[PDB]
Design a protein around this ligand. Structure first.
Ligand SMILES: Nc1ncnc2c1ncn2[C@@H]1O[C@H](COP(=O)(O)OP(=O)(O)O)[C@@H](O)[C@H]1O
Ligand SMILES: [Cl-]
Ligand SMILES: [Mg+2]
Ligand SMILES: [Mg+2]
Length: 241
């Protein structure tokens, strides 16, 4: 599998936040992670691209240990991330924001970088904004720039940590649409979300976290209409309908 996590334990000071997670994600997999805030979802996906370390267990991405100091560069080349907050460079255009890393990191000539960026911007519906600055864009558009930027590095894995959670309600659908499109293809995707209709339509597999644990996982239909675990049923009665 392209992501391999065995017996992951993680402490923030005295707080046992991740409690022996096992997770094996296939190449091409669309994995959706759900669960109450505080359950440990962000922390878990942050261990994948080495934004968080941990004291017990193993985390291996594309056959490389995340704790291998010699991998902490290849890991960032092949793993993209979209956060709920956009961190665009305010004094660079949309286009410049997208081409920066492929130019800095992959040492792509600007003409190559821009050609790919432009195709990506069209892909996510914002080619018209190519020469705008981030402050002229809505929340929906800015997050789509962040997605284009992540994809511009051409990673094998895209992590989405609740990309729509901080957006105005009318901004959510357009960002989710970009993620629906990407899910039609072969990219490995891990997305944390509270958008359950989306989760249900896109996921190969849904993982429910509570208390720093994977309490239940399975196919979307099973998890949403036949949850085998009580805490799962309890979580779904609190948030659905
Ligand atoms: N850098 C940190 N230091 C200390 N505690 C943290 C840190 N980051 C998160 N936490 C705590 O760890 C728990 C898990 O947080 P998080 O992974 O962000 O949960 P979720 O994303 O599921 O809402 C929360 O109780 C949070 O307060
Ligand atoms: Cl989301
Ligand atoms: Mg598929
Ligand atoms: Mg979170």
């Amino acid at each position: 599998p392209i992501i391999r996590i065995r017996n992951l334990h993680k402490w923030f000071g005295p707080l046992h936040v991740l409690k022996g997670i096992h997770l094996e994600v296939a190449p091409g997999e669309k994995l959706v992670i759900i669960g109450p805030s505080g359950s440990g979802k962000s922390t878990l996906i942050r261990t994948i691209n080495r934004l968080e370390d941990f004291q017990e267990g193993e985390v291996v991405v594309d056959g490389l240990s995340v704790k291998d100091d010699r991998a902490l560069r290849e890991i960032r080349r092949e793993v993209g991330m979209v956060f709920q907050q956009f961190n665009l460079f305010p004094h660079m255009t949309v286009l410049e924001n997208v081409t920066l890393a492929p130019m800095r990191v992959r040492r792509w000539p600007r003409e190559k970088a821009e050609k790919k960026a432009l195709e990506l911007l069209e892909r996510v519906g914002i080619l018209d904004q190519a020469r705008k600055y981030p402050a002229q864009l809505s929340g929906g558009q800015q997050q789509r720039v962040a997605i284009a930027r992540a994809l511009a590095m051409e990673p094998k894995i895209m992590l989405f940590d609740e990309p729509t959670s901080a957006l105005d309600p009318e901004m959510v659908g357009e960002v989710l649409d970009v993620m629906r499109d990407l899910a039609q293809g072969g990219m490995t995707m891990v997305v944390v979300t509270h958008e359950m209709g989306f989760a249900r339509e896109v996921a190969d597999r849904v993982v429910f976290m509570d208390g720093g644990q994977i309490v239940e996982e399975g196919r979307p239909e099973e998890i949403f209409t036949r949850p085998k675990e009580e805490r799962t049923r309890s979580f779904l009665q609190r948030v659905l309908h």
